Amino acid sequence: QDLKGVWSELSKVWEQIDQMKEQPWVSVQPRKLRQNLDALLNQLKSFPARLRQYASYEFVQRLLKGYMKINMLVIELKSEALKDRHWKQLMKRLHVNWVVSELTLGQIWDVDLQKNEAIVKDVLLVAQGEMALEEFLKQIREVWNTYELDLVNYQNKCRLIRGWDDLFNKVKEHINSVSAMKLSPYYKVFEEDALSWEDKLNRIMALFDVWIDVQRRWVYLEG
Amino acid sequence: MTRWVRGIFEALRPLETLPVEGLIRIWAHEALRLFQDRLVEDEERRWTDENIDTVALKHFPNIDREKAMSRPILYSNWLSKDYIPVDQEELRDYVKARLKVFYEEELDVPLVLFNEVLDHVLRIDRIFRQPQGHLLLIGVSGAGKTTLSRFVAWMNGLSVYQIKVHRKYTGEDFDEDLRTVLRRSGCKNEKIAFIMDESNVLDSGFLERMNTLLANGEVPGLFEGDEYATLMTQCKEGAQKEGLMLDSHEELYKWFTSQVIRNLHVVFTMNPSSEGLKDRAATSPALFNRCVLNWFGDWSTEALYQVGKEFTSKMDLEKPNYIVPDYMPVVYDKLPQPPSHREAIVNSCVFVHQTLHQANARLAKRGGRTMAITPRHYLDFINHYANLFHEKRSELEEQQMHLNVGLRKIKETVDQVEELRRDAKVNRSTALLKSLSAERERWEKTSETFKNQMSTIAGDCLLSAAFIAYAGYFDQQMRQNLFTTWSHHLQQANIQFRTDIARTEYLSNADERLRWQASSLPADDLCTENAIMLKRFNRYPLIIDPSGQATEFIMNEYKDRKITRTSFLDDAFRKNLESALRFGNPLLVQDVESYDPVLNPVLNREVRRTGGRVLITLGDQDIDLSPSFVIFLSTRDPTVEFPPDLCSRVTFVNFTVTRSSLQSQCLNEVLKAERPDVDEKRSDLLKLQGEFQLRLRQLEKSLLQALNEVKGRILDDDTIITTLENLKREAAEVTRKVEETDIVMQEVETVSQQYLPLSTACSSIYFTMESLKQIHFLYQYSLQFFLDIYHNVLYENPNLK
Ligand SMILES: Nc1ncnc2c1ncn2[C@@H]1O[C@H](COP(=O)(O)OP(=O)(O)NP(=O)(O)O)[C@@H](O)[C@H]1O
Structure with missing residues (x-):
């Protein structure tokens, strides 16, 4: 008769766990998940001692403990570093055919993230590296799309360019940084894009290295 | 008052x-x-x-x-x-629960609560609750400051602001940063913990603008101009939000000042007064007066004991048969009594730190160059002990499981040959069985030995872990002295450890040593230990190499990873460092005598996690730490006094020739040149560790490969015993040498003491040649000079013919 009691008192915990598992993966907030899991564990801790002897209660408590333990990897899986390519890599290595729009928290939960923590760590490491390279290229694009050549009037005849030191320092920094990015282990993904910017960067230098000269002599000759 | x-x-x-x-x-x-x-x-x-x-x-x-x-x-x-x-x-209990929450929320690093850190948590919280509450945490490098401040700020909901000083960071930039944080704290009513560190407080010119804020909460002249109008607008908006209707600009500014008093807090973090070289020297007494000062100090015996127990609790350091010694030496007077194996092991782990502090104090007493010892050394030691314990136990378990599989397959082959005896091939099956069973018995005893190896693993890892963490700066003689002290203390506590441990052999396989020697590694005991320290480092290493061999060694080792050379003195250093940190290529930075402070968080691994973007502050920028990044600091100068700030952030690796190092090198050279038999018996005494047994069971691997490849064709000629005889020889051979490991040790000792006065003369002669510099500027001679003299004297000597 105590089997009925433990099943009835564990049914509510099962409904809440399944309702959490049915949540789509996009809407998951891991901090709210930790709050709900902590509420569930504290609810389980209040059961009568007669029920606690059973193996089902121990199994469910261990299950929630495991979900708490892998909550760290769940947080890391909500990282913005992960992209479609990294989700594909996770699917291939873990041998699971997920659908990113249709993915639910329960499918990731029941997949043995605890056992497979090494694969998850490797994929998120690759994601971090590729995110670093991507945001570096984003910085290049923003800077050079927003860079304006300063001009200062010269004897009311024209406006000559000022700030050669800053321009050449920025060009040197970006060219050196792209050349160093070419050595990165995560470079193959962004390769083509990097090459494009390299060309433009070199052209920029190949212009202004001439331009300052064509300025200086002219100024001298003007004087 | x-x-x-x-x-x-x-x-x-x-x-x-x-x-x-x-x-x-x-x-x-x-x-x-x-x-x-x-x-x-x-x-x-x-x-x-x-x-x-x-x-x-x-x-x-x-x-x-x-x-x-x-x-x-x-x-x-x-x-x-x-x-x-x-x-x-x-x-x-509350702080422990909140700290366990903090582990998986902002920064995933364990943080032990001991009696002297809960108090600092409470003090920091108290100063956060007061109005105009500014804290000045002063104490040894490490010890929790910049980690407890962040923790309590997270607990109390204070958004942490940290200034990012660049080069050409004029006072106007600091003014603008102060304007932004003041607007956030006063207008928006957002509590802020304004954390400042000595690294970015290198210039004292901007630290007198802060004194007005600390004393009054308002710094006049910041918002002069249209900024005053915008701040007045936002201030009246905030006052309307709070429910107070104010019109006059003076009253609005007073209310803004009161809000800044309530909300904005300043948390200075400093080291004790060892910053004489800095422009601060001892910072102004006004700064001490304005803040509430908190002496962090250094972790006591109880703090080390507790932070050791909760880091080595996941390890299986339990021994039911631990015979407590009759009289134990104790650093922790409140040890549980009678101590168990875990208690004794952690007490020994604290003995390591205490003896190292005593050794550094003694070195200071005799005028030698000392190096700061900090809590981060203890944390690195415990981390190395845990990783090494796990690695060695995993290796031994793998070997024992493989040998059990081998015993299973041997029994299977016994069954197969018994089936073949049911059937003149049959007569010689009596011989193969006579081999097989013997091999079985051999493997059984091998399994027994593995059990004993279990009983010896723990202490051994300890004596290696400390060596990887602590004794990296010291010379060879003091390294050996510290190791003997640790071994004697372990023996005193009845902790089981190998008697004749070889550090360089216990921590590296012969393939790795061969690879290092293929690279530009001078093959010496000190140099091999240093090369191991460049492999098993948690914190980035500081290579003190006046010869310059170690830089080439690092370069050749990491050539596959496209390591690039840089120096602090180089103009294009910061950008190269930015690229290396951003993309993950390893880096070697030379001339760390002029250590830039911008590398302080990078060595400390102060990652700030925001979504998938893992930022670290460097100058103005916040750059993305790639996983592959590794940095090696280098010093051609062997006469350097690094700050205690850098010592806790880096592990030292001293490639410096000294009296004992050159003595050992010369003695080994003589033993190799004039008594090569003793050289063989010495190299064979350090090969009765992993090398020979590894080969002995690697032959069992090929045996088991060619043991179950059977379909009744095991008796092709009943001459498979040859493959079983090739293992019959070597076993007995490596059972002879294990038996003849005390005679050989005594013999090499007696024969090496004979050739020892020559080694002392060699060391004295070379150091006299080094001393010759201060007699005349031309009298400069490299160590290659003395070693070439010795090669001439040993090998190309016509008088020896
Ligand atoms: N109580 C603790 N338990 C465990 N680890 C700790 C503890 N306190 C500090 N640490 C670790 O020690 C390291 C350095 O701590 P931290 O206090 O930030 O150094 P620091 O005092 O800021 N050095 P500095 O900033 O130059 O004055 C970090 O890896 C922390 O996680």
């Missing part, structure tokens, strides 16, 4: 009523929190403890001391909505 009045006022403001004894208790608590924290020495704290009681009982007679002031005085606001006294255990 005004801080005292403010503290009692904030304590009493939410309280509806008090008794006199509660007032005395709050008075004593504020006395301790304002005066006892700044003190450095323990006895001064005891004097303050007694004097608070004396003054209270003098000016408040007939008030019983036990109720009015109990020694464990704590006031906190987390347990209850009111600022009332609370018990130690409840606060311990």
Whole structure:
């Protein structure tokens, strides 16, 4: 008769766990998940001692403990570093055919993230590296799309360019940084894009290295 | 005194009523929190403890001391909505729960709560609750500052702001940063913990703009111009949000100043007064007066014991048969008694730190160059001990499982040959069986030995882990002295450890040593140990190499990873460092004698996680730490005194020739050149460790490969015993040498002491040649000169023919 009691008192915990598992993966907030899991564990801790002897209660408590333990990897899986390519890599290595729009928290939960923590760590490491390279290229694009050549009037005849030191320092920094990015282990993904910017960067230098000269002599000759 | 009045006022403001004894208790608590924290020495704290009681009982007679002031005085606001006294255990439990939450929320690094860190948490929280509450945490490098401040700021919801000083970071940039944080704190009513560190407080010119903020909460002249109009608009918007209708600009500015007093806090973090080279020297006494000062100090024996127990609790350091010694040496007077194996192991782990501190003090006594020893050394030691324990136990378990599989397959082959005896091939099956069973018996005894190896693993890893963490800067002689001291202390505690441990052999396989020697590694005991330290490092290494061999070694080792050379003195250093940190290529930075402070967080691994973007501050920029990044700091100068700030952030690796190093090199050279038999018997004594047994069971691997490849064709000629005889020889051979491991050790000792005066003469001669510089500038001779002289004297000597 105590089997009925433990099943009835564990049914509510099962409904809440399944309702959490049915949540789509996009809407998951891991901090709210930790709050709900902590509420569930504290609810389980209040059961009568007669029920606690059973193996089902121990199994469910261990299950929630495991979900708490892998909550760290769940947080890391909500990282913005992960992209479609990294989700594909996770699917291939873990041998699971997920659908990113249709993915639910329960499918990731029941997949043995605890056992497979090494694969998850490797994929998120690759994601971090590729995110670093991507945001570096984003910085290049923003800077050079927003860079304006300063001009200062010269004897009311024209406006000559000022700030050669800053321009050449920025060009040197970006060219050196792209050349160093070419050595990165995560470079193959962004390769083509990097090459494009390299060309433009070199052209920029190949212009202004001439331009300052064509300025200086002219100024001298003007004087 | 005004801080005292403010503290009692904030304590009493939410309280509806008090008794006199509660007032005395709050008075004593504020006395301790304002005066006892700044003190450095323990006895001064005891004097303050007694004097608070004396003054209270003098000016408040007939008030019983036990109720009015109990020694464990704590006031906190987390347990209850009111600022009332609370018990130690409840606060311990709450802070432990919140810290375990903090692990998986902002930064995933364990943080142990010991008796001397909960107090600092409470002090930091207290200064956060006061108005105009600015804290100045001063203490040894490491020890929790910049980690406890962030932790308490996270707990209390204060958004942490840290200044990012660049080069050409003029005072206007600091002015703008102060404007932004002041607007956030006052107009938007967002509490901020304004954390400042000595690294970015290198210039004292901007630290006198902050004094006005600390003393008054408003810095006039910041918002002059249209900024005044915008701030007035936002300030009146905020006042309307709070429900107060204000018109005059002066009253609005006063309310803004009051909000800045309430909200914005400043947390300075400094090291003790060793920054004489800095422009600060000892920073201005005005800065000390304005803030509330907190002496962090260094972890005591109890703190080391507790932070060791909770880091080595996941390890299986349990031995049911641990015979406690009759008389044990103890660093922790409050050890559980009779101590168990885990207790004894952690006490020995604290012995390591205590003996290293004593050794450094002794080296200071004899005028030698000392290096700062900090808590991060202990944390690195414990981490290395855990990783090494796990690695060695995993290796031994793998080998034991493989040998059990081999025994299973041997029994299967016995069954197969028994089936073949059911059937002139049959007669010689009596021989193969006579081989097979013997092999089986051999493997059985091998399995037994593995059990003994289990019983010896723990202490061994300890004696190696400390060596990887602590004794990296010291010379070879003091390295051996420290190792002997640690081994003797382990022996005293009945912890089982190998008698004749070889550090360089226990921590590296022969393939790795061969690879290093293929690279530009001078093959010496000190150099091999240093090369191991460049493999098993948690913190990035500092390579002190006057010869310059180690830089080439690092370059050749990491050539596949496209390591690039840089120096601090190079103009294009910061950008190269940015690229290396951003993309993950390894880096070698030379001339760290002029150590830039911008590398302080990078060595400390102060990652700030925001979504998938893992930022680290460098100058103006916040750059993305790639996983692959590794940095090696280098020094051609062997005469350098690094700051204690850098010592805790880096592990030292000394490639410096000394008396004992050259003595050992010369002695090994003579033993190789003139008594090569003893050289063989010495290299064979360091090959009775992993090398020979690894080969012996790697032959069992090929045996088992060619043992179950059977379909009744095992008796092709009944001559498979050859493959089983090739293992019959070597086993007995490596059973002879294991038996002849005391005769050989004594023999090499006796033969090496004979050739020792030559080695001492060699060391003295070379160091005299090095001394020749200060007689005349031309009298400069490399160590290659002396070694070439010795090669001529040993090998190309016509008098020896
Ligand atoms: N109580 C603790 N338990 C465990 N690890 C700790 C503890 N306190 C500090 N640490 C670790 O010690 C390292 C350095 O701590 P930290 O206090 O930030 O150094 P620091 O005091 O800021 N050095 P500095 O900033 O130059 O004055 C970090 O890896 C922390 O996680």
